[PDB]
Design a protein around this ligand. Structure first.
Ligand code: HEM
Ligand code: HEM
Ligand SMILES: CC1=C(\C=C/C(C)=C/C=C/C(C)=C/C=C/C=C(C)/C=C/C=C(C)\C=C\C2=C(C)CCCC2(C)C)C(C)(C)CCC1
Lengths: 288, 32, 32, 37, 160, 215, 168, 29, 168, 215, 160, 37, 288, 29, 32, 32
């Protein structure tokens, strides 16, 4: 979860390569988008939409085994002193689509990298960030310009605990290599079910191989398929996205003179072509 | 989109105006 | 992020035509 | 890093020109000649 | 009217040129005033305007500073480089693609030798070009788009 | 006054210049796309002006390169304009030039009397792309530093020379300060001179031989 | 019917004038570009290396009649004079000559600074004794404050000349 | 928050007018 | 009496040939000039910043199955593998792909390195699993010595391929 | 074969080039010192070659400039040759050019039909001296760092503009990194282009008007 | 023999030139082979030789690194600068010498206007030049030597 | 810093040339004319 | 003396300006030269001559007053690992002119800055240093090249003690301003003679003004010439020089190829001019 | 220790010969 | 240190002459 | 000085040799 990102990787969610640490545990890949407009003006509330699509009507494996809906997380990282819009200022239908979300900052001070989630899958198909542009006229190391924004979003539960052990939403190899002896089925007054399998004859050969509850097995009886294998099948309907995107923090002034300089041009251009015409005419008095 | 489309129409329009207009002014005080 | 490209394509292409016509049209309004 | 706006800029004009290019080759290859080669 | 001047085909000199592949700038609209003086500036000024405009509404990024230990995933070259880089990367032969690059230049030179078998300009009159051209112009674009994509929905361009 | 035109006219025969200009005509199969050339050129002059403007702030040194670009953006007056224009106009030149390749080819402007022109055109083409690859990595940021890293490896595939070529290219065995050094000399002193000698032929021929004919 | 010179020259003037508009338009930012960023945009002495002369083992390890250089303001080198019952002199003598500005040395014998460049000389405090240097050497206020040295523009008049400080 | 839009239109309009002007200007193709 | 072509062409050959002598003479140093100085002219691991990985709170604060970069030799980045009953692996895996040489990442899931540049893949020790990369990743000898790490050229054969090390 | 000269001759009219060269004569009052010109030129090409050779090692940055010159001397192969040749040939160009000023003047080659040539000559003269002052201080050592310090103060005497001019010159109020920056752009990108446009006129006129006459 | 060609003074065209200040490269030793092909390379190659020679036997120094707090005493400019710097430093007027510098250029331009009063080349035939020239050429040298010297045995050049 | 070797190089040629320069102006202004101006 | 240079200014005799500390105490100026050849080859003994001219037959003032001959000192500073030639190697007439001199190094290690003196004026009019060039083929941070050498020499005794008080070979002002009262003449059983003078009436006015022995006075009786004045005259026939000079540490190889490349040239040049001749001849068959 | 001298002579000789060659070559002034 | 200049002057000047004569002399030995 | 003067004489001398010599060889096997 977004929090254990923070928890495990304190000063940043992204490495120098652009990865985003999240992808260390969430092993699946599924697409993530991130729209925001092409330009904002300074001091402005504006929307940024995170997208995290997954096929709504299907289910993943849970802790113990059940077979439950699922949840989107996501860290987004806005450019320098962008921050979530202060709330008197979000206006209205926006309040509404933002919903009930928690925009938590990746470390004290960095308001511009926000963790978000675990939200529940079905209303958080798309996730809105109401955000507000800095103002380079008043914060004196914010300049106008074009800047990057990076999302990495994930949806559905992951493959490794922040503690270092495997979850059950992956798929177990087979330790050594030989002929299997026993598909037991544990369920001790707690920590539920437990398919207990093991291999043999060859050389040494009695190694034991438990495998949590909620994968399948699709490897049955007899057998010996080699060095850590098939046995499980793939529980994991989950997984992780990434997106980068540009945004220009524009200054209306630049826009204003630009527009002026253009008309100044268009005008000149017609004015020449006008001249030319007036010459095509003094010329017609020079063939005859 | 709808906004550009307008501003856009008006903007060309307007110059197209000046264009045509100023031929004529320019034609009939006989400069062209 | 891929419909900025679309628009751009789209109008890089379209707008040519418009300018085209538009000048041609001027052209008439004055007579070659 | 990919650059959207430009990429439309490109195909846009690329095609548009390939376009008019063949379209004049035609206009021209059908009105032929004029003034005597 | 336009403004005009008819090849004067009685002139030994012009003739001897038309002859050679070229008296061509001897007949037509006069190029002083007419086309330099008046329309030039239009083309130049317009050209400038667009580029300024572009530059103002969608300026230059500055990206991260360079890290000798990181390859950034998502690294493309500039765009006009894609096509080649496409090739370069669907061609397990190192040494090969490099030749294959080089050919774009070499080949491109070769053309007017080859295509000199005859002598028409207009491509309508010259089927076999207009094809291997259309052909290649197309592969080029398609190989182009090719890196806008991921490794291997790459050539299939993700539809087969 | 005390006639100026004359003064020159006496000495230099200034006339011939004009009589030479004004005696040239434009054939009517010469339609809009025969601007592609001059546009690509226009683009390039814009390069040369904005480019040299940046040589007053850019540091081509591995510590200061990247930083300095930021100064340009950021703190020099119109830094962003200047630089951004450089950036867009690169692209417009690489493109408008492809567009002009198309009009030449589907006009067979490259045909007999003119094969030299086409040949030079292609060299211009290669020099422009190199203007390109080199410029791109002077900011000595993440994307540009890997481009030098890849494209300098490429030469190495070639068998006898090829390593040796790569070392000239990058100034040692591995991309480093010599590289940004050499890359700068390249983008700002070699390429421009090269580009001019060859636009010089490309225009000289064209002037001598007049535009291709009609279709 | 065919327009008369005088009306070509009207239309000339219009396009050719409006074309300039474009040209200067484009020129302007380009010029402003080249004019360097104003550093004076929106204090404490400094050592050759660049360290805050800590006043106390600068009292200590230089002498009496000594006179030693120190990044003044605009970081110009400024001579701070150790005086002959030693604490500091009020003002510091800013070290650039006034000609084209080499850094001028204290000639300890002739009690007198002399520009090694083309010649000018100046007295035990500033006042311009030979030329090609026009005015005399700049000044400034030196205090002991927090035990850095703290140089302040010398705003008041030319204690050595009466009327206005030439440089401020 | 759409001088921003007037913004781009201004580009579109020169692109247009420029072509436009060139064709008008030379009975254009 | 007037010398015959054939003897002009003798005298041509003499001056025109000797003139080349001068020209290549001058060319030569000029070429040698441009060919960069040999750095291999007439060792200890290093950190991103540039500090001598002190082996002991590098054991300490990385894990088991971890694999972390480190200026190898020719200062090429070289991945040093923390092994699963932790001291160090003998050899280090030199990190540049073998294609045009981006620095290749350990994908911890698929236990496998993959070049982000155009695609090539490589296995848990080196051996070249996809291309466009020709050979597999370089190697080298890692010792604990004075408690720096001390990398040595890997001179012996391709433990992972049998015959000759491609790179040495 | 399959005649090469022809090939060109067809297309370009290559002949006219030769017929133009070979149809020019040398008058007998044209004695040794009418080499002064071409020598000054020769000198300059030597500059351009050795110069650009140094742009592959020189750092124009206040930390690395000085150090790098030392690398050139010192450690680059023939560094010392290259640099030393740059150094001597500067001087030979400033001198051979003074010598050519003398032969022009006491030949009155600058007289009527030719006053333009002489004028351009003088501008070449100024640009050469600037090649000079700028180059001299790129090593950013003791003597060169004071030259920028003096010569940049000079402009400041002039009343309205003059301060403003000095700041362009040096890139701030005081000599510093902008200065070596600007000075480099100058010596390696402005001056050379300037020097070529104006040797271009100086040779064009001369070709057009032929050498002054006899005494 | 030499090799030679006599102005052909019957040629309207040459005449009209001699006329103008210039048919001058029409008569004489032919410039192809003769002077380009053969002697050129001599002058160029010699020029190179000397400079290489000079460069080898008496190479470039590298001097001390720059110190913002030191003026080095003994600082001159390059040599061809001495004359001016002489002036610059015997002219207590700051603003003046600077004009005085500037004039060398401006004045030098002025010359062919002025000296156009007549029309002879040969300086023997033109006394008044050959003097103010000799004159100035001399002052120049003497002002030159002037900084090879100390402040003020300077103008007197140390002999009065 | 002063530079001896060059300084002789200079006067040396300066004078030597001023020399031959006037000496041809003379040779020439005394053999006059030849071939007819 | 050269030693107190060392004593007062340890890590170097020259400041960043090029002065040479000596000139702080020796206030006179008289010329100093320094020749050495234009080139040396590596590993070579060669001469460097210091010159320190002064008019041999005249005398300066001494400690107490006497009126004694005088002495040249001098620090010379050779370029990088130049050092004094090792003595088996100086050869013979050189041993001889070097004489009886002490070449003492300015600090341990720097063999390439040598103090020298106090020598006695009359044989040490010129002072020879037998020196030996380094060898860049064997000391691997010595390169071929052109390098500077700096002398500053002085001759006759100086104006300030390393302790900070005045010597007697200068000339005393006059403290305040007024009318003088007394030309006394002390000579207490030690530290000899002592002209004792003083001023007055004006305002305050009794200040006392001793003045060692051996200046003159040329200010006599009555008087009042102002703020620290005339009184003494100039004892000091002494004083200090400075010289800088270039030397090239050449490598015969460079010389060898150079010589070769030249003949290669001269040859080519004759060979062209030969051709030209052969053409001036085929041409003579083309006028007739 | 006078290849050093042969050294300079070599310069002197090109200077000479070059003039020499040029005059010979063009019946010279 | 000032007689390096002397020689140089001196022979820059003299040597010219020598080369002069020397070529002139050649010139004779072949006959113009 | 005395040394150059010699080496110098011999050196030119020697080339002057070759010069003259090779005209003649070159003259009388009739090439000139
Ligand atoms: C845009 C309207 C435009 C046209 C149209 C155009 C045409 C054109 C032609 C036909 C030639 C061949 C000329 C001949 O037969 O002598 C040609 C040559 C050159 N052009 Fe042009 N050109 C247009 C636009 C521009 C612009 C804006 C420039 C400015 C850079 C330009 C430049 C050039 C150059 C350079 C040549 C070189 C050859 C020559 O004869 O000068 N073009 N162009
Ligand atoms: C040395 C022997 C030498 C001579 C002699 C010489 C002469 C010369 C003349 C008379 C002119 C005027 C030409 C005319 O009337 O067309 C002239 C012009 C140029 N020169 Fe030449 N020159 C000599 C030496 C050299 C050398 C080595 C070069 C090589 C750079 C050179 C160059 C030039 C150039 C450039 C011109 C431009 C004018 C033109 O008509 O080309 N000179 N030179
Ligand atoms: C290096 C070089 C060069 C150069 C140069 C120079 C730089 C200079 C020169 C110079 C010269 C070349 C000079 C000359 C001079 C001369 C003179 C100065 C003369 C004089 C004389 C007199 C005085 C006289 C006389 C006489 C006689 C001798 C004979 C007759 C008679 C009489 C008696 C009259 C050249 C280019 C050349 C080439 C190679 C390289």
């Amino acid at each position: 979860y977004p929090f254990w990102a923070q928890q495990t990787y304190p000063p940043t969610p992204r490495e120098p390569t652009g990865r985003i640490v999240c992808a260390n545990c969430h092993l699946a890949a599924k697409p993530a988008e991130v729209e925001v407009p092409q330009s904002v003006l300074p001091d402005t509330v504006f929307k940024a939409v995170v997208k995290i699509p997954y096929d709504t009507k299907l289910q993943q494996v849970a802790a113990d085994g059940s077979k439950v809906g699922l949840n989107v997380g996501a860290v987004l990282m806005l450019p320098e002193g962008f921050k979530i819009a202060p709330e008197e200022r979000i206006p209205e239908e926006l309040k509404k689509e933002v919903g009930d979300v928690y925009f938590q900052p990746y470390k004290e001070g960095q308001d511009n990298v926000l963790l978000v989630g675990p939200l529940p899958g079905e209303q958080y198909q798309e996730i809105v960030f109401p955000v507000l542009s800095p103002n380079p006229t008043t914060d004196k190391n914010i300049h106008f310009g074009k800047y990057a924004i990076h999302l990495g979003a994930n949806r559905g539960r992951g493959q490794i605990y922040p503690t270092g052990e495997k979850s059950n939403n992956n798929v177990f190899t087979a330790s050594a290599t030989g002929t299997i002896t026993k598909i037991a089925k544990e369920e001790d007054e707690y920590g539920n079910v437990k398919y207990q399998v093991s291999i043999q004859t060859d050389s040494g050969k009695t190694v034991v191989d438990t495998i949590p509850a909620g994968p399948e097995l699709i490897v049955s009886e007899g057998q010996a398929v080699k060095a850590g294998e098939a046995l499980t099948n793939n529980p994991n309907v989950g997984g992780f996205g990434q997106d980068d995107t540009e945004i220009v923090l524009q200054d209306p002034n630049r826009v204003k003179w630009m527009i002026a300089f253009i008309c100044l041009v268009m005008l000149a251009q017609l004015m020449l072509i006008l001249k030319k015409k007036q010459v095509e005419k003094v010329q017609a008095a020079e063939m005859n | 989109m709808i906004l550009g489309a307008v501003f856009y129409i008006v903007f060309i329009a307007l110059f197209f105006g000046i264009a045509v207009g100023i031929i004529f002014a320019i034609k009939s005080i006989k400069l062209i | 992020m891929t419909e900025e490209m679309l628009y751009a394509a789209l109008l890089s292409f379209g707008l040519i035509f418009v300018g085209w016509g538009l000048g041609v049209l001027l052209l008439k309004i004055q007579g070659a | 890093m990919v650059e959207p706006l430009l990429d439309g800029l490109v195909l846009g004009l690329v095609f548009a020109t390939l376009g008019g290019l063949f379209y004049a080759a035609y206009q021209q290859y059908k009105r032929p000649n004029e003034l005597g080669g | 009217m336009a403004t005009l001047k008819k090849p004067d085909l009685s002139d030994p000199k012009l003739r001897a040129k038309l002859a050679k592949g070229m008296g061509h700038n001897y007949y037509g609209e006069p190029a002083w005033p007419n086309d330099l003086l008046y329309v030039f500036p239009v083309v130049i000024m317009g050209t400038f305007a667009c580029i300024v405009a572009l530059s103002v509404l969608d300026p230059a990024m500055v990206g991260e500073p360079a890290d000798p230990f990181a390859t950034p995933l998502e690294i493309l070259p500039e765009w006009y480089l894609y096509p080649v880089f496409q090739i370069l990367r669907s061609v397990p032969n190192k040494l090969l693609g490099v030749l294959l690059m080089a050919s774009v230049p070499l080949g491109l030179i070769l053309v007017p030798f080859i295509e000199n078998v005859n002598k028409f300009q207009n491509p309508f009159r010259r089927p076999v070009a207009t094809t291997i051209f259309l052909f290649g112009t197309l592969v080029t674009i398609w190989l182009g788009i090719g890196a806008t994509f991921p490794l291997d929905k790459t050539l299939t361009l993700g539809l087969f | 006054m005390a006639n100026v035109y004359d003064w020159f006219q006496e000495r230099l025969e200034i006339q011939a210049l004009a009589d030479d200009v004004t005696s040239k005509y434009v054939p009517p199969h010469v339609n809009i796309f025969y601007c592609l050339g001059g546009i690509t050129l226009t683009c390039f002059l814009i390069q040369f002006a904005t480019g040299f403007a940046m040589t007053f702030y850019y540091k081509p040194t591995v510590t200061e390169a990247y930083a300095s670009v930021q100064y340009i953006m950021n703190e020099v007056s119109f830094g962003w304009l200047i630089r951004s224009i450089h950036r867009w106009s690169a692209s417009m030149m690489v493109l408008m030039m492809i567009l002009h390749v198309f009009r030449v080819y589907l006009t067979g402007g490259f045909k007999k009397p003119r094969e030299l022109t086409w040949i030079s055109g292609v060299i211009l083409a290669v020099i422009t792309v190199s203007f390109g690859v080199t410029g791109y990595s002077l900011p000595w940021d993440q994307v540009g530093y890997w481009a030098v890293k890849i494209v300098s490896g490429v030469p190495e595939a070639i068998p006898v020379v090829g390593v040796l070529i790569s070392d000239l290219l990058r100034g040692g065995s591995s991309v480093g300060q010599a590289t940004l050094t050499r890359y700068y000399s390249a983008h700002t002193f070699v390429l421009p001179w090269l580009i001019a000698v060859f636009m010089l032929l490309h225009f000289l021929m064209i002037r001598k031989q007049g535009i291709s004919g009609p279709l | 019917d065919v327009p008369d010179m005088g009306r070509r020259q009207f239309m000339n003037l219009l396009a050719f004038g409006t074309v300039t508009g474009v040209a200067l338009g484009a020129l302007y930012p380009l010029v402003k570009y080249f004019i360097p960023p104003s550093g004076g945009a929106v204090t404490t002495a400094k050592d050759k290396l660049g360290n805050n002369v800590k006043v106390s083992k600068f009292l200590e390890s230089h002498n009496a009649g000594d006179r030693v250089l120190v990044q003044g303001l605009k970081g110009d080198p400024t001579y701070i004079v150790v005086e002959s019952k030693e604490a500091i002199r009020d003002y510091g003598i800013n070290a650039v000559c006034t000609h084209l500005g080499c850094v001028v040395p204290w000639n300890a014998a002739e009690n007198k600074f002399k520009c090694p460049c083309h010649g000018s000389q100046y007295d035990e405090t500033g006042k311009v004794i030979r030329g090609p240097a026009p005015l005399s050497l700049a000044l400034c206020h030196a205090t002991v404050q927090d035990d850095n040295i703290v140089l302040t523009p010398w705003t008041e008049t030319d204690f050595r000349t009466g009327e206005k400080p030439w440089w401020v | 928050m759409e001088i921003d839009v007037l913004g781009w239109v201004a580009l579109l309009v020169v692109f247009t007018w420029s072509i436009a002007m060139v064709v008008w200007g030379r009975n254009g193709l």
